[PDB]
């Protein structure tokens, strides 16, 4: 099955703490998650200059295996990642992210509530490129959310963020 039943030029190093709690009485599937996040561009309430970071994080966070905590499945990610932007996209100097938002999906019988918490502070710990050593789910999620990128000509494995 695919189902999860109820619990019963500009470069930045960001220390990142990511948490998504999914709330679903009837349980949920990856398919539903992909439908929800399809429209993240038009739901995200945070700092636009940082939506690139958030999408990346949301993708990695949801590509892990969660844990049951109360009436929620809980995905946690805690990494130090390096992001590179093209042109003039991305955060201004010394700018940081403290984002949280409830996204609630509701379609007839199916009902899923996503609680997203992403914090990102600039640290001096050399971090890892977000776009290497990910898994198919991470990629699949970045594709859904329409993650805008452009390829680095220097390094093959590198993607510049366009948002």
Author numbering: 30 to 37, 48 to 202
Sentences reproduced from the published study:
The rhabdovirus matrix (M) protein is small (∼20–25 kDa) but plays a number of roles during the replication cycle of the virus. In addition to its structural roles, M has been implicated in controlling the balance between transcription and replication of the viral genome, in promoting budding, and in modulating host-cell transcription, -translation and -apoptosis.
The structure of LBV M was solved by SeMet multi-wavelength anomalous dispersion phasing and refined to 2.75 Å resolution with residuals R/Rfree = 0.207/0.255. While the central α helix and back 5-stranded β sheet overlay very well, the loop between sheets β2 and β3 is much shorter in LBV M than in VSVNJ M and no stretch of helix is present between these sheets. Strikingly, in the structure of LBV M a stretch of peptide is again observed bound in a shallow hydrophobic groove formed by the β1–α1 and β2–β3 loops of the globular domain. W112 in the β2–β3 loop sits under residues 33–35, its indole nitrogen forming a hydrogen bond with the carbonyl oxygen of P34. The interaction with the most likely monomer, related by the crystallographic symmetry operator [1+x−y, 1−y, 1−z] (23 Å from E37 Cα to E48 Cα), generates linear polymers of non-covalently linked molecules in the crystal.
